[PDB]
């Protein structure tokens, strides 16, 4: 990949992201699901809420094909990808994980929105990582 693409990839699979922790028990959730009726959990532990939104983008760029659309609401995820491509033109393992898998796209759009704002495939993601992890 070249950059991050301006706009949605136009046939490319979306996957809404995200992570879920708990603080007392570092037990938590990570996962996604997208608008080609794909979904995926993963449970985690000795994990935090940053290094869930991590893993959700992990595993999103893991299934994906060479082209993908990624929503998630997490500005640190963002950043962190943001960052590496503007250097290239905390949680170190994970992030080297991510890029290994960025590196390996042809197009990736990354937009962040704002979570528990009512927007559709972020509340289905969310509902599926937070069961178990944070109370309803
Ligand atoms: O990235 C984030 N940031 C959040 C911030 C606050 C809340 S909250 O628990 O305080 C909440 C819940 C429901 C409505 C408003 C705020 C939940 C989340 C969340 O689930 N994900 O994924
Ligand atoms: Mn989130
Ligand atoms: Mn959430």
């Not at 950059?3 to 992201?17: D, H, M, N």
């Not at 995200?18 to 699901?33: C, F, I, Q």
């Not at 082209?67 to 491509?85: C, F, H, K, M």
């Amino acid at each position: 990949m070249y950059q991050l693409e301006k706009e949605p990839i136009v046939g490319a699979e979306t996957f809404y992201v995200d992570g879920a922790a708990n603080r007392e028990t570092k037990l938590g959730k990570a996962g996604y699901v997208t608008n080609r009726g794909r979904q995926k959990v993963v449970t985690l532990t000795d994990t935090t809420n940053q290094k869930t939104e991590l893993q959700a983008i992990y595993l999103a760029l893991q299934d994906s094909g060479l082209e993908v659309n990624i929503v998630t609401d997490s500005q640190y995820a963002l950043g962190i990808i943001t960052q590496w491509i503007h250097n290239w033109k905390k949680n170190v393992d994970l992030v080297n994980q991510i890029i290994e898998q960025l590196i390996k796209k042809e197009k990736v759009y990354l937009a962040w929105v704002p979570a528990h704002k009512g927007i559709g495939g972020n509340e289905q993601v969310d509902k599926l990582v937070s069961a178990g992890i944070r109370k309803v």
